[PDB]
PDB file of C-alpha atoms in Angstrom:
ATOM      1  CA  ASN A   5     130.305 160.620  92.579  1.00  0.00           C
ATOM      2  CA  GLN A   6     131.644 164.025  93.609  1.00  0.00           C
ATOM      3  CA  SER A   7     134.106 163.953  90.700  1.00  0.00           C
ATOM      4  CA  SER A   8     132.555 165.756  87.717  1.00  0.00           C
ATOM      5  CA  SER A   9     131.648 169.430  87.531  1.00  0.00           C
ATOM      6  CA  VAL A  10     128.064 168.644  88.600  1.00  0.00           C
ATOM      7  CA  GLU A  11     127.443 166.550  91.709  1.00  0.00           C
ATOM      8  CA  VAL A  12     124.452 165.262  93.630  1.00  0.00           C
ATOM      9  CA  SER A  13     123.185 166.468  96.996  1.00  0.00           C
ATOM     10  CA  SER A  14     123.840 163.368  99.103  1.00  0.00           C
ATOM     11  CA  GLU A  15     124.450 159.634  98.952  1.00  0.00           C
ATOM     12  CA  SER A  16     120.709 159.066  99.353  1.00  0.00           C
ATOM     13  CA  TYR A  17     120.341 159.805  95.633  1.00  0.00           C
ATOM     14  CA  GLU A  18     123.182 157.473  94.666  1.00  0.00           C
ATOM     15  CA  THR A  19     121.534 154.595  96.549  1.00  0.00           C
ATOM     16  CA  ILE A  20     118.587 152.346  95.727  1.00  0.00           C
ATOM     17  CA  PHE A  21     116.617 150.962  98.666  1.00  0.00           C
ATOM     18  CA  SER A  22     115.047 147.561  98.147  1.00  0.00           C
ATOM     19  CA  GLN A  23     111.845 146.468  99.844  1.00  0.00           C
ATOM     20  CA  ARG A  24     112.452 142.712  99.857  1.00  0.00           C
ATOM     21  CA  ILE A  25     113.243 140.726 102.981  1.00  0.00           C
ATOM     22  CA  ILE A  26     115.600 137.772 103.432  1.00  0.00           C
ATOM     23  CA  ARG A  27     115.890 135.257 106.264  1.00  0.00           C
ATOM     24  CA  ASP A  28     118.545 132.700 107.141  1.00  0.00           C
ATOM     25  CA  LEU A  29     117.969 128.963 107.405  1.00  0.00           C
ATOM     26  CA  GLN A  30     116.014 128.114 110.544  1.00  0.00           C
ATOM     27  CA  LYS A  31     115.726 125.076 112.775  1.00  0.00           C
ATOM     28  CA  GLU A  32     113.084 122.580 111.713  1.00  0.00           C
ATOM     29  CA  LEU A  33     110.054 121.380 113.678  1.00  0.00           C
ATOM     30  CA  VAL A  34     110.149 117.706 114.648  1.00  0.00           C
ATOM     31  CA  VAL A  35     108.648 116.745 118.021  1.00  0.00           C
ATOM     32  CA  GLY A  36     105.882 119.340 118.194  1.00  0.00           C
ATOM     33  CA  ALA A  37     103.199 117.505 116.244  1.00  0.00           C
ATOM     34  CA  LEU A  38     104.002 113.793 116.105  1.00  0.00           C
ATOM     35  CA  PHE A  39     102.029 112.354 119.036  1.00  0.00           C
ATOM     36  CA  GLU A  40      98.291 111.910 118.849  1.00  0.00           C
ATOM     37  CA  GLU A  41      96.234 114.406 120.814  1.00  0.00           C
ATOM     38  CA  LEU A  42      93.641 113.740 123.505  1.00  0.00           C
ATOM     39  CA  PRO A  43      90.879 116.375 123.585  1.00  0.00           C
ATOM     40  CA  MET A  44      89.891 117.414 127.083  1.00  0.00           C
ATOM     41  CA  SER A  45      86.879 119.212 128.524  1.00  0.00           C
ATOM     42  CA  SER A  46      87.610 119.580 132.258  1.00  0.00           C
ATOM     43  CA  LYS A  47      90.477 120.165 134.649  1.00  0.00           C
TER      44      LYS A  47
ATOM     45  CA  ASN B  21      90.040 126.874 139.979  1.00  0.00           C
ATOM     46  CA  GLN B  22      89.591 129.393 142.793  1.00  0.00           C
ATOM     47  CA  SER B  23      90.528 132.403 140.658  1.00  0.00           C
ATOM     48  CA  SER B  24      87.218 133.966 139.634  1.00  0.00           C
ATOM     49  CA  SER B  25      84.589 135.325 142.016  1.00  0.00           C
ATOM     50  CA  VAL B  26      82.577 132.081 141.969  1.00  0.00           C
ATOM     51  CA  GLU B  27      84.163 128.697 142.630  1.00  0.00           C
ATOM     52  CA  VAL B  28      83.276 125.013 142.869  1.00  0.00           C
ATOM     53  CA  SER B  29      83.284 122.746 145.934  1.00  0.00           C
ATOM     54  CA  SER B  30      86.043 120.282 145.017  1.00  0.00           C
ATOM     55  CA  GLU B  31      87.901 118.691 142.118  1.00  0.00           C
ATOM     56  CA  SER B  32      85.243 115.969 141.939  1.00  0.00           C
ATOM     57  CA  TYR B  33      83.085 118.557 140.176  1.00  0.00           C
ATOM     58  CA  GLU B  34      86.004 119.595 137.960  1.00  0.00           C
ATOM     59  CA  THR B  35      86.897 116.061 136.839  1.00  0.00           C
ATOM     60  CA  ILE B  36      85.681 113.413 134.413  1.00  0.00           C
ATOM     61  CA  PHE B  37      85.723 109.802 135.586  1.00  0.00           C
ATOM     62  CA  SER B  38      85.931 107.494 132.582  1.00  0.00           C
ATOM     63  CA  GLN B  39      84.852 103.859 132.652  1.00  0.00           C
ATOM     64  CA  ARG B  40      87.440 102.992 129.997  1.00  0.00           C
ATOM     65  CA  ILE B  41      89.846 100.355 131.296  1.00  0.00           C
ATOM     66  CA  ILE B  42      93.297  99.768 129.803  1.00  0.00           C
ATOM     67  CA  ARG B  43      96.057  97.211 130.365  1.00  0.00           C
ATOM     68  CA  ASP B  44      99.814  97.100 129.804  1.00  0.00           C
ATOM     69  CA  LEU B  45     101.661  94.519 127.698  1.00  0.00           C
ATOM     70  CA  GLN B  46     101.614  90.862 128.728  1.00  0.00           C
ATOM     71  CA  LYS B  47     103.985  87.923 128.477  1.00  0.00           C
ATOM     72  CA  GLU B  48     103.227  85.475 125.692  1.00  0.00           C
ATOM     73  CA  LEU B  49     102.565  81.812 126.449  1.00  0.00           C
ATOM     74  CA  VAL B  50     104.357  79.256 124.269  1.00  0.00           C
ATOM     75  CA  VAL B  51     105.090  75.997 126.079  1.00  0.00           C
ATOM     76  CA  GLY B  52     101.713  75.116 127.571  1.00  0.00           C
ATOM     77  CA  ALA B  53     100.168  74.226 124.227  1.00  0.00           C
ATOM     78  CA  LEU B  54     102.576  72.554 121.818  1.00  0.00           C
ATOM     79  CA  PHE B  55     102.786  69.030 123.267  1.00  0.00           C
ATOM     80  CA  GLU B  56     100.301  66.417 122.116  1.00  0.00           C
ATOM     81  CA  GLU B  57      97.616  65.457 124.617  1.00  0.00           C
ATOM     82  CA  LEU B  58      97.001  61.878 125.776  1.00  0.00           C
ATOM     83  CA  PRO B  59      93.474  61.326 127.126  1.00  0.00           C
ATOM     84  CA  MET B  60      92.993  58.937 130.026  1.00  0.00           C
ATOM     85  CA  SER B  61      89.989  57.187 131.539  1.00  0.00           C
ATOM     86  CA  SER B  62      91.488  55.644 134.676  1.00  0.00           C
ATOM     87  CA  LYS B  63      94.048  56.370 137.353  1.00  0.00           C
TER      88      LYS B  63
END
């Protein structure tokens, strides 16, 4: 806080680092896996 | 394939010939078979 008589060394001790991760909304999957699939065993 | 050290003679030995036979859609027949039939025994 750098305001009282006794301070702290650096902002690293005034800060809490979280370990959790957040992601935005993403595009959905639609046409990838709708058709039936024909297994193949040659060129 | 012609990428490795050993190859094959032609695509005929890299192919599968299937005996399965398939057909497209076909027109439906309506008029030939709704009128009553009159048998005859002379000209």
